[PDB]
Amino acid sequence: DKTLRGSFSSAAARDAQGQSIGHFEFHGDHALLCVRINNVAVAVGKEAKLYLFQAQEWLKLLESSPGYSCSERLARAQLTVTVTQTEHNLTVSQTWRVFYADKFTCRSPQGEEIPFEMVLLNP
Numbered sequence: 001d002k003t004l005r006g007s008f009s010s011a012a013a014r015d016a017q018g019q020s021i022g023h024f025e026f027h028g029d030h031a032l033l034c035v036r037i038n039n040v041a042v043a044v045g046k047e048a049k050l051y052l053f054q055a056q057e058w059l060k061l062l063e064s065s066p067g068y069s070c071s072e073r074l075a076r077a078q079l080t081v082t083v084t085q086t087e088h089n090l091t092v093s094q095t096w097r098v099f100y101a102d103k104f105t106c107r108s109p110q111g112e113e114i115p116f117e118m119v120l121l122n123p
């Protein structure tokens, strides 16, 4: 299992073409990633989204020449969630890597960062 607290940042996401939140590995066919936020209106206003990549697929994208554009690489995520509620549970079926992006990432006042808590459960 894993627990992480932090904040989703438009600046961090724009800087790296997706803000890297974390990574995880698990044994078995399914795991549950639970994401909690309080500021839903700010997330909806930014079109906040999470992108999950299988780290082997993500590495293949980064090793491609010339390389994918910001939007094309995020469109190749294995799983996504559009952040519209205080909690979203993602069933991850099969290392995995999690990224945050919003309407400013692949392009206006960018507002403030969105605090979050993420819990990963392996069953």
Ligand SMILES: *[C@@H]1O[C@H](CO)[C@@H](O)[C@H](O)[C@H]1NC(C)=O
Pocket: 034, 087, 088, 089
């Ligand atoms: C996420 O999973 C937890 C644990 O089963 C549950 O308590 C919670 O209600 C779920 N939330 C949503 C939005 O499905």
